[PDB]
Amino acid sequence: MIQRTPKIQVYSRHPAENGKSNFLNCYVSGFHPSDIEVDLLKNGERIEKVEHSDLSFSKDWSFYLLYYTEFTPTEKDEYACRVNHVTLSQPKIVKWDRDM
Amino acid sequence: SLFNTIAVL
Amino acid sequence: GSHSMRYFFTSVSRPGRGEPRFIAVGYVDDTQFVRFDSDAASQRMEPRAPWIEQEGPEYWDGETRKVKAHSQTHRVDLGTLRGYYNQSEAGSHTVQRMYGCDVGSDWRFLRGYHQYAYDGKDYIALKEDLRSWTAADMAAQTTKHKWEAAHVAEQLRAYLEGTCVEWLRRYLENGKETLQRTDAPKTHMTHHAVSDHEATLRCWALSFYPAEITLTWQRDGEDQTQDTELVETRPAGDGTFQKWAAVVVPSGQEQRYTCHVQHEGLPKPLTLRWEP
């Protein structure tokens, strides 16, 4: 029963430009066991059309998943990824920074 | 192509 | 260069109701090409790269039959393991298996492997000779002795050395336009004022394949580790990868720093310098 907490990165597929369609990614990795809850958020609200990769794992047996959605960035809209996992006492939120 | 027969523990 | 074919299998027990969730994925190098999910409607092995779609119905039928056989083995194993570890029927547990083969740049057999984990730790693995097993604890030791007595490794060895390689070579040729193409990193640098006296330089590598890459910062031609940050290599979603590395520098001293990029796609490493 080892448990490992997820690492999280939130980023766009392409360099973000306001008004140009893009993909918002939430990459979760390093975690065990595999049950995990991931939502992408627009101004705090859960985005409905979110897909994810097929579950796979790394050399140390820890799991990774990509969650993604199409989006069109704008100057004022904020995006984030919210993750819950048995290793977390509460859900973790990471905000999208277009420079990271 | 997968292996045809994985044995049990 | 070298190449590999690897299959990954996860099975998670569901004590409240029903059978274990089973997910299998197959890769050539860093490219996923097939998947199976026991909860999906199709109940079939499914393509995940265009180049596998040219395989005919007998292929899909056979891979479906095999992957479903694998799901049953993992189900039985979850039972056996809960007994070996004296665990209750109440908790969920996980088995993970990976097997496959590497070839060299000549596309001939280099090495085979077959590893198994229980609850995220090593359980039993085939040794590099492909004739005996390594057990991590006394439960797996019982498995090792059973499998050695039964010669479980000999059909597996024949697969890893023969069949696996033949298929990997077939996939490489049928997938040639992508699988035999390297995508060199598309690189650039960004600059971010932190204060009046310090800045951050961030070196970007985008849209590369395969995933293996090295990004290093130097100051006046020596490797610098302090005041740096590197993110884990991450998928773009379109089959390529991304990474960046950053360094914090005194404002006005940016030109001392170089970012060095090494990748299979680059005949010589790239050096980036903020002199814009």
Author numbering:
A (entry chain B): 0 to 99
B (entry chain C): 1 to 9
C (entry chain A): 1 to 276
Q: What do the paper's sentences say?
A:
However, based on previously solved structures [A2–SLYNTVATL, A2–SLFNTVATL, A2–SLANTVATL, A2–SLYNTIATL, A2–SLYLTVATL, A2–SLYNVVATL, A2–ALYNTAAAL, and A2–SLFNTIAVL (21)], some of which we replicated in this study, we show that A2–SLYNTVATL, A2–SLYNTIATL, and A2–SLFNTIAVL all adopt a similar structure to every unbound SL9 peptide variant, apart from A2–SLFNTVATL, when ligated to the 868 TCR. Detailed analysis of the thermal melting of A2–SLYNTVATL, A2–SLYNTIATL, and A2–SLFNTIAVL by circular dichroism showed the melting temperature (Tm) of the wild-type peptide was higher than that of the triple mutant (57°C compared to 49°C) suggesting that the triple mutant is less stable. Stabilisation of HLA A2 at the T2 cell surface in the continuous presence of 100 µM peptide (steady-state binding) showed that the SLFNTIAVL peptide stabilised HLA A2 with 89% of that seen with the wild-type SL9 peptide after 3 h. This relatively minor difference increased in an overnight assay where stabilisation with SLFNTIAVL was ~65% of that seen with the wild-type peptide. By contrast, the half-life of A2–SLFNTIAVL on the same chip was <2 h. In stark contrast, most of the HLA A2 stabilised by the SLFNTIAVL peptide had decayed in half this time. Collectively, these binding data explain how previous studies, using short-term binding assays in the continuous presence of peptide, have shown minor differences in the binding of SL9 and SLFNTIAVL escape variant. They also suggest that the dominant mechanism by which the SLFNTIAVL mutant allows immune escape is due to this peptide producing a much shorter-lived peptide–HLA complex. Collectively, our results suggest that the instability of the A2–SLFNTIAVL molecule is likely to provide the major mechanism of escape from SL9-specific CTL.
The majority of these studies have focussed on the immunodominant response through the p17 HIV Gag-derived epitope SL9 (amino acids 77–85, sequence SLYNTVATL) (6–23). Instead, in the face of SL9-specific CTL pressure, HIV has been observed to undergo preferred mutation at positions 3, 6, and 8 in the epitope. Here we use structure and protein biophysics to deconstruct how HIV escapes from the well-studied SL9-specific 868 TCR. We add to the existing data by providing the first ever TCR–pMHC structures in this exemplar model of how HIV evades engagement by host TCRs.
